[PDB]
PDB file of C-alpha atoms in Angstrom:
ATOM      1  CA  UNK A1487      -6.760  11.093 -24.257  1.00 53.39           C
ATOM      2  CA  UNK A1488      -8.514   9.698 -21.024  1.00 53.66           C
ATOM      3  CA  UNK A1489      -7.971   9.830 -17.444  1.00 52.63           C
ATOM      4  CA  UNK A1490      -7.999   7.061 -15.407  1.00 54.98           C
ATOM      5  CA  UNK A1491      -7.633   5.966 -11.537  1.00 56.40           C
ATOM      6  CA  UNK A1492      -6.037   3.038  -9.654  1.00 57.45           C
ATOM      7  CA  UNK A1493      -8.275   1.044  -8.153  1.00 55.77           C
ATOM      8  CA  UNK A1494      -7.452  -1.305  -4.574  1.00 58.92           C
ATOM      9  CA  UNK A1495      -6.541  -3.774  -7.046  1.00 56.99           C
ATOM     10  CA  UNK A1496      -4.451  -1.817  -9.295  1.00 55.29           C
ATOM     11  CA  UNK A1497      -6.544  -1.982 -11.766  1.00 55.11           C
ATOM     12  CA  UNK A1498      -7.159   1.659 -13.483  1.00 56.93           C
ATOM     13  CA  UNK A1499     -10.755   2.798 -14.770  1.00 57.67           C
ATOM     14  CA  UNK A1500     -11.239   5.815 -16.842  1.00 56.03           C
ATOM     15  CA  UNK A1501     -12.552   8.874 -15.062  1.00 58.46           C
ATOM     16  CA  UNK A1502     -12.023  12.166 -17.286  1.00 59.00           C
ATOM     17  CA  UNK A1503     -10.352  13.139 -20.614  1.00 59.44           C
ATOM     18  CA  UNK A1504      -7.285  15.119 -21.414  1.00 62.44           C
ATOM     19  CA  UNK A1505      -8.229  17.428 -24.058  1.00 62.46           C
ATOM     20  CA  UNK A1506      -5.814  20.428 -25.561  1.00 61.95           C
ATOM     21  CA  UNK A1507      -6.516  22.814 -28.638  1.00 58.72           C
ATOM     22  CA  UNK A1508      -4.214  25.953 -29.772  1.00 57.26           C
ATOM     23  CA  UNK A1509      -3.722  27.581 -32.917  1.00 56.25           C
ATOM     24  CA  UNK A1510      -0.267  28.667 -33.404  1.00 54.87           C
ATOM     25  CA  UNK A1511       2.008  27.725 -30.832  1.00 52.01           C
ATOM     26  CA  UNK A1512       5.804  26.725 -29.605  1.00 49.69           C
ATOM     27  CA  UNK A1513       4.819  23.789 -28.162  1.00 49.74           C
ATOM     28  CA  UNK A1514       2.392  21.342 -26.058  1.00 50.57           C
ATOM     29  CA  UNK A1515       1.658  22.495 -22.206  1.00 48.39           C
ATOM     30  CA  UNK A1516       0.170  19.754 -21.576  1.00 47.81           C
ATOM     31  CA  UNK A1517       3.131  17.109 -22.134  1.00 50.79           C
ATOM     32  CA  UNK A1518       5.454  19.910 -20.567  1.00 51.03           C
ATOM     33  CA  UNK A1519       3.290  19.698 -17.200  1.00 52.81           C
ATOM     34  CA  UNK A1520       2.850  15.972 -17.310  1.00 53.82           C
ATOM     35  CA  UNK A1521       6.742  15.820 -17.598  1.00 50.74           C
ATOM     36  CA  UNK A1522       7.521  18.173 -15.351  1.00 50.12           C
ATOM     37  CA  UNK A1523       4.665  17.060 -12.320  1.00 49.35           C
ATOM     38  CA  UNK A1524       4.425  13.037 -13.240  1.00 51.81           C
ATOM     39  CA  UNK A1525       6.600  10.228 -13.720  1.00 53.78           C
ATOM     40  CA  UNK A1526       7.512   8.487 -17.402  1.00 51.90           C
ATOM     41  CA  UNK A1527       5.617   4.530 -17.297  1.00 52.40           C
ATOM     42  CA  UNK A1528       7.928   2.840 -19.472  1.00 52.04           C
ATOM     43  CA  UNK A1529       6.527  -1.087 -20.168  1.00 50.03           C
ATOM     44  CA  UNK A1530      10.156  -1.635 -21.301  1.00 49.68           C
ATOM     45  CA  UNK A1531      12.181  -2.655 -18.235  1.00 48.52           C
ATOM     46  CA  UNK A1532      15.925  -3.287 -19.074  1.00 48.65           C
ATOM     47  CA  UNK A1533      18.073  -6.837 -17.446  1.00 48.42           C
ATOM     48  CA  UNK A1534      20.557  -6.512 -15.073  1.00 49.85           C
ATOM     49  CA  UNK A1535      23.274  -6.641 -17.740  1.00 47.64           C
ATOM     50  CA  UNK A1536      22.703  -7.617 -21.237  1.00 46.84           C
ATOM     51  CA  UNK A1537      22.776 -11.578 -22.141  1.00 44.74           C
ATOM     52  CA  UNK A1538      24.742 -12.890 -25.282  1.00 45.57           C
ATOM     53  CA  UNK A1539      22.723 -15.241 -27.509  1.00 42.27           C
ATOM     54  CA  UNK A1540      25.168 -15.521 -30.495  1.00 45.50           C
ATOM     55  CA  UNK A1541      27.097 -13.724 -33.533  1.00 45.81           C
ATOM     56  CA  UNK A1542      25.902 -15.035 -36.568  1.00 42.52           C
ATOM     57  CA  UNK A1543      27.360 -14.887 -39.978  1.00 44.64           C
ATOM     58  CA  UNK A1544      24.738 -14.234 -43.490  1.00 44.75           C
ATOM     59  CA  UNK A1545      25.506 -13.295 -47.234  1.00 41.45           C
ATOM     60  CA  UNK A1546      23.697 -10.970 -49.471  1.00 42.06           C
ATOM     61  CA  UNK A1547      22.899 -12.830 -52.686  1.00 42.15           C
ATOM     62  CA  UNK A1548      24.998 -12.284 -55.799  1.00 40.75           C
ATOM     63  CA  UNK A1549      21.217 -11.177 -57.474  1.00 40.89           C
ATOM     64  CA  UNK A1550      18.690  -9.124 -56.346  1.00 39.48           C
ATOM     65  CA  UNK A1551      16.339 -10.541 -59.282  1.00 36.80           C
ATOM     66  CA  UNK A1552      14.747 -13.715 -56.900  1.00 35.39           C
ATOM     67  CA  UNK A1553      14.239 -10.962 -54.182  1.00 36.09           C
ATOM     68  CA  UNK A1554      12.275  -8.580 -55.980  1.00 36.95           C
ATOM     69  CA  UNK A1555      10.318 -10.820 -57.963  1.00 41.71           C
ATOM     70  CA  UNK A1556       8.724 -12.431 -54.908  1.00 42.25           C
TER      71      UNK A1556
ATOM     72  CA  UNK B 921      -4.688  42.388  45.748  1.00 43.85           C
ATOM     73  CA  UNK B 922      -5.648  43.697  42.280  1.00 42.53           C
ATOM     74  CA  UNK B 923      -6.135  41.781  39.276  1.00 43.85           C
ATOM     75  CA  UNK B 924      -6.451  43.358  35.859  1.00 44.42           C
ATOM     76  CA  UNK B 925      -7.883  41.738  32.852  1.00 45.82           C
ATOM     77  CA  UNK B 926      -6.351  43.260  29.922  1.00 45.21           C
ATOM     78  CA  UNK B 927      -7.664  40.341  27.918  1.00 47.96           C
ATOM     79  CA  UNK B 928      -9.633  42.015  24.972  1.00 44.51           C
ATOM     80  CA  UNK B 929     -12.268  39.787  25.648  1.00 45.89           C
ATOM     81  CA  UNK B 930     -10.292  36.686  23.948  1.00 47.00           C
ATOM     82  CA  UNK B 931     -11.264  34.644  26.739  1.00 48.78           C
ATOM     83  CA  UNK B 932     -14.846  34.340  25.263  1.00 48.84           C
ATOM     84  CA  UNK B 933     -13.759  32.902  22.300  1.00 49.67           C
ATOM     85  CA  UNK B 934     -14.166  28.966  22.432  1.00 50.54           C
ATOM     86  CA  UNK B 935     -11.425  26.570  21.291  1.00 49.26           C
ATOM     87  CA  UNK B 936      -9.102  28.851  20.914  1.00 48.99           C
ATOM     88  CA  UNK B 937      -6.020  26.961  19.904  1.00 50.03           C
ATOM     89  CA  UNK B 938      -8.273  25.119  17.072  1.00 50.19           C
ATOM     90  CA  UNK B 939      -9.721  28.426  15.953  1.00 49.11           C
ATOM     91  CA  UNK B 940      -6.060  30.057  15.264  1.00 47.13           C
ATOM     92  CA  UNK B 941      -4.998  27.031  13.918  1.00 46.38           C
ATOM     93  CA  UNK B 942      -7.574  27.187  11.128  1.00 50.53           C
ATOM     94  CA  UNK B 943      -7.316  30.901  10.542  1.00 47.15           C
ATOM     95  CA  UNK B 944      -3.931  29.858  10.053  1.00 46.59           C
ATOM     96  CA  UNK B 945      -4.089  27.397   7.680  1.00 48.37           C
ATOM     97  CA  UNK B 946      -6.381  28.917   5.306  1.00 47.90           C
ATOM     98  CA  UNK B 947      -4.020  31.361   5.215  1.00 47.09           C
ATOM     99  CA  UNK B 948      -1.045  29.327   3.993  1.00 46.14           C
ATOM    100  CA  UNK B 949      -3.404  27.464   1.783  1.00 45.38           C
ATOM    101  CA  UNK B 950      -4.393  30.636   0.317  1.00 44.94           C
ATOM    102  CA  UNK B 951      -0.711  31.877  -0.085  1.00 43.47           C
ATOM    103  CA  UNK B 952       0.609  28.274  -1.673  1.00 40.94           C
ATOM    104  CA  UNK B 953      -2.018  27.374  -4.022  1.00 40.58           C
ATOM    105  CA  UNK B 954      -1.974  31.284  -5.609  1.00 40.31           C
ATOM    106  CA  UNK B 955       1.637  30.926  -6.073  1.00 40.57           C
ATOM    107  CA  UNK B 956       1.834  27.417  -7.205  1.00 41.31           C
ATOM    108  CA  UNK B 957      -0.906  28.197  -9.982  1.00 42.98           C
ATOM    109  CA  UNK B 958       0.693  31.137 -11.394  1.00 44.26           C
ATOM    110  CA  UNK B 959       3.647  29.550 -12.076  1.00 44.93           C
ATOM    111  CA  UNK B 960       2.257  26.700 -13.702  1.00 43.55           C
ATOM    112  CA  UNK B 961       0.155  29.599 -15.424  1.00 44.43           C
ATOM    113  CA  UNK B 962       3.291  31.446 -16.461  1.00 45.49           C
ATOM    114  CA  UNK B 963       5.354  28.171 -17.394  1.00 48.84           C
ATOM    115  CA  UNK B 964       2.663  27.172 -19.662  1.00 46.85           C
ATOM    116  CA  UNK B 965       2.622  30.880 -21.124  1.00 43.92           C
ATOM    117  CA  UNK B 966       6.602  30.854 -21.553  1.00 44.07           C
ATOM    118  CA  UNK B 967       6.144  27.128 -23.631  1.00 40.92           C
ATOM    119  CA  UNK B 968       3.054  28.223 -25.466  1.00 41.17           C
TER     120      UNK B 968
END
């Protein structure tokens, strides 16, 4: 995969590539050492506490026949 | 009044404090970046 710098205006731009091949092996050094030296960007970032939107109520059909024929 | 220079000639050595300084710290340089890289060597050995 490729290697890439911030820039001044956060921006990144690509400036090497990560490349990794073993024959048989326990495992990948290369995630091991990113996990153990970087930090995990995660684009999921969680709310303070959870909001409630609503508990709905729904019914399976008394046929699968419609279902499956569409 | 006698004075004795038992100096070893140090004195002609210019900048002293900057020249032990450096000797110095390519000397820990030396020391930390050897160690550091064998153990990432030998981690990566251990999980290969």
């Amino acid at each position: 995969g490729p290697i890439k710098v911030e820039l001044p205006t956060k921006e990144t731009v690509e400036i090497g590539i990560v490349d990794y091949e073993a024959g048989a092996s326990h495992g990948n050094p290369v995630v091991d050492f990113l996990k153990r030296n970087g930090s995990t960007l995660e684009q999921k970032v969680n709310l303070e506490n959870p909001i409630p939107i609503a508990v709905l109520d729904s019914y399976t059909p008394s046929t699968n026949e419609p279902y499956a024929r569409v | 009044p006698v004075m004795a220079d038992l100096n070893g000639g140090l004195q002609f050595v210019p900048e002293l404090k900057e020249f032990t300084a450096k000797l110095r710290k390519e000397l820990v340089e030396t020391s930390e970046v050897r160690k550091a890289v064998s153990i990432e060597t030998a981690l990566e050995h251990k999980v290969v």
